[PDB]
Amino acid sequence: ANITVGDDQELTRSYQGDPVENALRDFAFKSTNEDFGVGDDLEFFFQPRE
C-alpha cells in the first residue's frame, strides 16, 4: 500500500548487481521522479513527490 508507481513500465535491464538505492533511483528516474525510503514504521515506501 506504500507503493504508488506513477508511470509503471517493464524493466529491460537486469539490475542484478546494483546497490538497492541506486536501482531504486533508476526506477524513480524511469517513473514520475518518486520519493523512496524507510519510514519510522520501519516500512519501505515509493510514492509521488510533494
Partner 1 sequence: DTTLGNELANTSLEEILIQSASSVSAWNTILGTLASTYPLVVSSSGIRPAQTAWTTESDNLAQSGTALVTVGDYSNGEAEGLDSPGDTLELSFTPEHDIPGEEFALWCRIETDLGGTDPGPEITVTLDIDGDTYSWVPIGTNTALGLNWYDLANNTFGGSSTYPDTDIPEGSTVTLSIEATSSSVSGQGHAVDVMAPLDALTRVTGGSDATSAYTFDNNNGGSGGYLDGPELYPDQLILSLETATTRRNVSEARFTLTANDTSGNFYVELANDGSTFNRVNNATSGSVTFASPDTNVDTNISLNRYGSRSTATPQTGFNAQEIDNWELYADIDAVLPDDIGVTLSRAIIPP
Binding site residues, partner 1, CB under 8 A: 6-7, 9-10, 12, 31-33, 48-50
Instruction: Provide, rounded to whole angstroms, the least separation between the CB of residue 40 and K ion.
Output: 27
Instruction: Provide, rounded to whole angstroms, the least separation between the CB of residue 42 and partner 1.
Output: 28
> In the structure grid, which three cell numbers stand for residue 41, read together?
514504521
3-state secondary structure of 50: coil
DSSP assignment of 6-37, as one string? SS-----S--TTS-HHHHHHHHHHHTT--EEE
User: Of the two residues 11 and 43, which places its CB atom closer to partner 1 in the complex?
Assistant: 11
Instruction: Provide, rounded to whole angstroms, the least separation between the CB of residue 36 and partner 1.
Output: 15
